[PDB]
Amino acid sequence: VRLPGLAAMRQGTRLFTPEQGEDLREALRRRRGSFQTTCEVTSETTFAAARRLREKASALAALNFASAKNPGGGFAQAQEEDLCRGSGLYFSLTSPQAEPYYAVNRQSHSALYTDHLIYSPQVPIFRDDAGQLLPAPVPVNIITAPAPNAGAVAQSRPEQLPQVLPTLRERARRVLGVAAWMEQTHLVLGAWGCGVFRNDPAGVARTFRELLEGEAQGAFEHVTFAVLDNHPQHPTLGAFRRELESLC
Ligand SMILES: Nc1ncnc2c1ncn2[C@@H]1O[C@H](COP(=O)(O)OP(=O)(O)OC[C@H]2O[C@H](O)[C@H](O)[C@@H]2O)[C@@H](O)[C@H]1O
């Protein structure tokens, strides 16, 4: 039997095309300065921070560290795979209205990818990190967007190297712009493409904080950076702790 909430979420899945970029900027403009934004940095999984926040959250959204080319990246240790094995996210990402995001990214033939985003609303979370069922499913909105593949740019098209950071900065701006357009109050962010995509975890942490300090200042109630780091040296998490300290 089909799981509860899957059909409503798949039916409501929506694509933001790159020609909507100024619609998303204006939504950020219009929402600037609405609250006192509290921003933590934690050790939890994206979905752990989600299930924590949901009882305080009018409008909960979390960022999927997405593959540009096939839904779920084709599945092993990555965040998007965490989200799919424990939620109905995959049923949304394979929806018909989302096909253009995967189709155009493939035709792009560029490691920086395009500026399409997938908004999946009310995605049921069914399991915790240990993998056990949940009493009741807890729903979360998911913005899906690929960070530029810094690793593939360096190994395949170094000419685009100077474009990695601008690309990541404008794309992060559209992610917050989607969240503002959908009037979301609580954002679960993280180490967007600092694992398999090889981006510099210091760079994405400061790019986030720059926008949270400028264009997106006050735009959301509560931002949670849920950076999972199992490596003993803890360099990813330590980069977001270090870089987000002034803003909290
Ligand atoms: N379950 C998790 N929950 C929260 N944070 C996590 C989790 N797993 C890892 N992190 C942290 O988030 C950081 C980045 O996790 P990554 O998934 O590599 O995102 P990307 O930007 O590199 O590219 C994702 C690609 O890899 C996949 O194949 C996708 O399909 C894409 O093709 C990790 O280093 C962790 O510190």
Residue numbers in the entry: 29 to 103, 107 to 279
Which passages does the manuscript contain on this structure?
Despite the abundance of PARP1, most of the PAR generated by DNA damage is rapidly degraded, with a half-life of less than 1 min by poly (ADP-ribose) glycohydrolase (PARG). The radio-resistant bacterium D. radiodurans encodes a PARG homolog, DrPARG, whose expression is upregulated after radiation damage, so it might play an important role in DNA repair. Our study demonstrates that DrPARG is involved in catalyzing the breakdown of endogenous PAR and DNA repair in D. radiodurans. From observing the structural peculiarities of DrPARG, we show that although previously thought to be an obligate exo-glycohydrolase, bacterial PARG could exert both exo- and endo-glycohydrolase functions.
